[PDB]
Design a protein around this ligand. Structure first.
Ligand code: FAD
Ligand code: FAD
Lengths: 401, 401
């Protein structure tokens, strides 16, 4: 089952969380981690947040303390693995044996085909190197165009506006945060960004670019000094595909993290896995999944009596004055709005229900509500809906009881 | 790898094909097949075709000759399996041990929620029992309503019209055969059925039924003596789900038929698997997949040097005077029409191309063209497109050369 030695491909959050849990759970055999970035393992959420603003990479490193006795091969790329021979081929000419192989290779930004031959700066934002490159171009009064209205693009928009950068944003869908964000939240977020001076363009797509100017499918133009593309990510599943594992923009895994290849597991952004709320497979793209799935897979490898991964999805986003938290599903058959939705000191909570059962929640500038809502969500609570609306109600009381 | 004894759950085409290939490839260990239907293994395509018309089940049995030394437990249901203990629990109180378990449990017709409490005959068409029940109600001059415009519904429509039954058909999508059929084919097929007296209703859905009359979402009614629902199927993946395998309306498998659980494989209609043409995972619902995937998985179990499953998708449908064959993808960036599309002695070929490469083909009443087209499709041929259109061209010549 858990056969030594353990080899993990990728040295991001999922990998670090996994190897720390292996050690904490009592596994004492070899652990070797192969990471292609020549960087002390680091967390990505700061890259479009405080790092983009203040630039200190020594504030964003992951804690590998709970992972003693691990050899981290940084700056080296796993090029293939042979699941029959139980070996991994590295870019430095070495080969690693494994008893258990764990693919934690994450995902990479999708390129925008229409900007392939661009002769102006076009960047994506995934790595520390990416963040440093973008930051170097955030000149005050310069013009930035962001393609894509997902959370990372919006976080960059906010950061850029704070830095005195003019920002335009092109979104093909009619709303921001089209993936896993309630419409009510998305509409409010657009109003917020518009009020901060972001030039939002909905239902437009980029058709190309010429001499520092981007072209749109409504026949118009947007001049910019830099483009940052953020239209989503694609799983880094090439090694799995080549080795014969089941993959489709993501490695399919069960709740134990098992791939279709015996002795090969996968975790984090690279996986396509069951969302327990929808009961469908999806590629989850969140910090909490990377950490939680890594921990759960490790725990069950060391102790097979442990349950499989079962945590429900959630994320957060920091966009200027908006501290956004979202859990579960973006929609059901009912939304309850707790508080007023207003640009004047924004503070509200949304609750999504399905036939009376909580299936999702949102908090904007209300961290205290979010924890009890996630507990109610976890057990599929069916609370009195007037109480959920009634601002006199205390959610922590409800969650404990 | 291939560990004896072998246990297969399900006794349909995929199972029979798999166990016959195990024997032909030289595996001599135990094989036991558990089949819930108390029927000599039989093929399903005749059920909406010649069987529905002539009623002789002894013309539709599968050949288990190439599968000697197999114990077939007919009329018994596998209730669960324990992948740790390597056992299967049967409905008759017995337990089977396995070295290799193969899930070939197929799929079952989706029920129509709006007809759940119906007080008129409502059937689906999957099994021999289903076919016999429907056939018993095909009284001449009776009225049949079919819900769903997939191939099986259309085959039943044709059979019913031939039997003198009045037929109406409700399809929610704007075209028939919305799944994997080129629009050009679908439009022609509608014209054909309309000309044979089928009352087609597009872009309508069933909202309910009252006293022998079905209600539609345009506020209208259709009276019928029998409803046959054919809005698709759902994978029979309950045992896999309960045992912890990765599933999502279908058991995920790689090209070797491996599930996420070691020593457990899956084949046929129950699987979600890579379509090599699209490069995406899909649940394939075809006779050729059931046979071909079963054979390929068996071959590779006995001989691990054999390639994984690699066949490209295709199916056929017999609808009255229309002998339809479809291979590959329903669309690309180009369609070439070979011949005239006409209700007067229908006979034509479609070819779908993507950047010059053949990615799909259709033949209506032209079996001789279909085989060379599938060969061109298999190697991704990029033939001269004027020649593909030019009716003077011989496709068999092209395929050999
Ligand atoms: C800018 C940014 C902001 C974000 N903000 C938030 C947030 O506020 N909240 C939130 O919920 N989530 C956020 N996320 C998402 C989050 O960070 C991811 O879900 C998380 O990084 C996934 O971790 P991972 O370990 O699975 O993958 P990764 O972090 O991508 O780590 C995988 C590593 O493996 C490497 N690798 C790939 N292939 C190979 C190979 N063949 N050999 C060796 N190494 C390889 C990769 O280069 C990478 O270093 C953000 C992400 C970004 C980029
Ligand atoms: C009416 C009809 C017409 C068709 N026409 C065509 C056609 O012209 N061309 C074409 O390409 N395809 C056609 N098909 C599709 C085709 O027949 C299927 O793709 C094929 O039957 C799939 O084979 P299978 O072995 O995977 O599944 P199945 O045939 O469904 O066999 C699975 C068996 O396992 C049984 N089972 C399920 N669970 C258990 C359990 N727990 N224990 C024991 N047994 C279990 C099932 O009841 C079933 O008997 C048609 C299908 C139907 C129903």
């Amino acid at each position: 089952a858990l056969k030594a030695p353990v080899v993990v491909l990728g040295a991001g959050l999922a990998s670090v969380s996994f190897v720390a849990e292996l050690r904490q759970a009592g596994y004492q055999g070899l652990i070797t981690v192969v990471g292609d970035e020549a960087e002390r393992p680091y967390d990505r959420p700061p890259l479009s947040k405080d790092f983009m603003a203040h630039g200190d990479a020594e504030k964003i490193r992951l804690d590998c303390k709970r992972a003693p006795e691990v050899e981290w091969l940084l700056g080296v790329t796993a090029q293939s693995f042979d699941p029959q021979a139980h070996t991994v081929a590295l870019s430095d000419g070495r080969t690693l044996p494994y008893g258990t192989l764990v693919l934690a290779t994450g995902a990479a930004p999708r390129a925008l085909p229409t900007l392939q031959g661009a002769t102006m700066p076009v960047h994506t934002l995934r790595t520390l190197e990416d963040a440093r490159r973008i930051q170097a171009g955030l000149r005050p009064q310069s013009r930035l165009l962001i393609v894509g209205g997902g959370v990372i693009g919006l976080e960059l928009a906010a950061t850029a506006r704070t830095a005195g950068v003019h920002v335009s944003l092109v979104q093909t869908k009619p709303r921001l945060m089209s993936r896993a964000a309630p419409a009510t939240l998305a509409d409010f977020v657009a109003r917020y960004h518009a009020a901060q001076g972001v030039d939002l363009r909905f239902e437009r797509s980029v058709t190309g670019s010429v001499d520092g100017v981007v072209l749109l499918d409504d026949g118009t133009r947007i001049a910019a000094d830099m483009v940052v593309v953020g239209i989503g990510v694609l799983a880094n599943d090439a090694l799995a595909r080549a080795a014969g594992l089941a993959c489709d923009d993501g490695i399919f895994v069960d709740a134990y993290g098992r791939t279709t290849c015996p002795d090969v597991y996968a975790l984090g952004d690279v996986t396509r896995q069951r969302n327990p709320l929808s009961g469908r497979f999806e590629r989850i793209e969140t910090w909490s999944n990377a950490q939680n799935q890594g921990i759960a897979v490790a725990r069950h490898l060391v102790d097979p009596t442990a349950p499989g991964y079962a945590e429900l999805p959630w994320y957060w986003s920091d966009q200027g004055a908006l501290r956004i938290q979202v859990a579960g599903l973006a929609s059901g058959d009912e939304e309850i709005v707790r508080g007023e939705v207003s640009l004047d000191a924004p503070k509200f909570t949304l609750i999504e229900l399905q036939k009376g059962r909580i299936v999702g929640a949102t908090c904007v500038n209300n961290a205290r509500d979010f924890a009890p809502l996630r507990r109610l969500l976890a057990v599929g609570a069916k609370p009195d809906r007037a109480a959920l609306a009634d601002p006199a109600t205390d959610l922590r009381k409800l969650a404990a009881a």
